[PDB]
Amino acid sequence: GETLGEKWKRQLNQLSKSEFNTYKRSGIMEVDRSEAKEGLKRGETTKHAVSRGTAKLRWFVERNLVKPEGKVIDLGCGRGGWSYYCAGLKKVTEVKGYTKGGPGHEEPIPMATYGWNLVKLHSGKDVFFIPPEKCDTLLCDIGESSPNPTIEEGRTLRVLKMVEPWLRGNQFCIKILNPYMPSVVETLEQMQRKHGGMLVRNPLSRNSTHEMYWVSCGTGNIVSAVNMTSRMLLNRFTMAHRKPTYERDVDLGAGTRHV
Numbered sequence: 001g002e003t004l005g006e007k008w009k010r011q012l013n014q015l016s017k018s019e020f021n022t023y024k025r026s027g028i029m030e031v032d033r034s035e036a037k038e039g040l041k042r043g044e045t046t047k048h049a050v051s052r053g054t055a056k057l058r059w060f061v062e063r064n065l066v067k068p069e070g071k072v073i074d075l076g077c078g079r080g081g082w083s084y085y086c087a088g089l090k091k092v093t094e095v096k097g098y099t100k101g102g103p104g105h106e107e108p109i110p111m112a113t114y115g116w117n118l119v120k121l122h123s124g125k126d127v128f129f130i131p132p133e134k135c136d137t138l139l140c141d142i143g144e145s146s147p148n149p150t151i152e153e154g155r156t157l158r159v160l161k162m163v164e165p166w167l168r169g170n171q172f173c174i175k176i177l178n179p180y181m182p183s184v185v186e187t188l189e190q191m192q193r194k195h196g197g198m199l200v201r202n203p204l205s206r207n208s209t210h211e212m213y214w215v216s217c218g219t220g221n222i223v224s225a226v227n228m229t230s231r232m233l234l235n236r237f238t239m240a241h242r243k244p245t246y247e248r249d250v251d252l253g254a255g256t257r258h259v
């Protein structure tokens with residue numbers, strides 16, 4: 001009597017490599033990253049978003065699902081995609097990004113995109129072990145995938161326990177790696193009651209992950225959101241019209257900001 005999400009995961013893990021590669025992009029929204037990738041390889045530091053993450057966060061911001069403002073803390077900042085984007089938003093006054101260093105983990109990329117001077121990224125900073133800090137906006141994009149959904153479940157619950165102390169009177173956008181397991185749904189219901197917001201599927205996410213984001217603005221039934229996302233993902237395995245929808249990548253400009 002598994003959840004629809006569990007049914008999706010078992011089916012995903014049964015795909016061949018070619019099937020997986022076709023499925024992951026079927027009918028998704030996608031930014032053309034060729035130009036940014038080539039530029040970044042050449043050491044270019046203006047205009048380019050450092051990752052696909054900038055476009056993901058832009059989608060939420062454009063729809064007023066999160067409204068970054070004041071002091072922004074970005075947990076699991078990686079290369080800095082979310083941080084460099086927030087740096088260009090009018091209401092943002094400072095951005096601090098923290099990420100885990102080490103082999104196999106992405107390190108921050110120094111960039112000169114608009115508002116770069118308001119951003120301080122720091123590697124070698126495992127957020128599970130640091131004290132929470134006051135901020136006006138809390139972003140978190142942590143959650144490592146695994147073919148084992150119980151491992152993802154444990155990762156998601158650990159992230160949720162970790163972020164809660166950082167939430168008080170502030171905007172937020174937090175990745176929920178595995179939102180479909182019963183303990184996670186229940187945890188999310190409790191945290192939504194305590195801190196508000198809603199759970200949303202980003203159309204730029206690949207079909208190979210069931211990730212959803214808990215955003216501070218709006219409200220909605222979490223069980224419905226999760227189940228409708230699971231149904232969509234299950235239905236995409238045998239999608240008749242699977243062409244992705246392409247959008248231009250984000251241009252983050254250049255120059256310092258004065259607040």
Ligand SMILES: C[S@@+](CC[C@H](N)C(=O)[O-])C[C@H]1O[C@@H](n2cnc3c(N)ncnc32)[C@H](O)[C@@H]1O
Nearest residue numbers: 051053076078080081082099100105126127141
């Ligand atoms: C998907 S990425 C971030 C993408 C980012 N939002 C962007 O737009 O470029 C998640 C990052 O969180 C980092 N991470 C994982 N566990 C962490 C921890 N305990 N503390 C800090 N960072 C962590 C990973 O190394 C990875 O770089």
Ligand SMILES: OC[C@@]1(O)OC[C@@H](O)[C@@H](O)[C@@H]1O
Nearest residue numbers: 161163164165166167168194
């Ligand atoms: O509502 C916020 C809070 O009180 O929730 C319970 C724990 O997570 C605390 O660390 C956290 O500050």
Ligand SMILES: [Cl-]
Nearest residue numbers: 219220221224
């Ligand atoms: Cl609803």
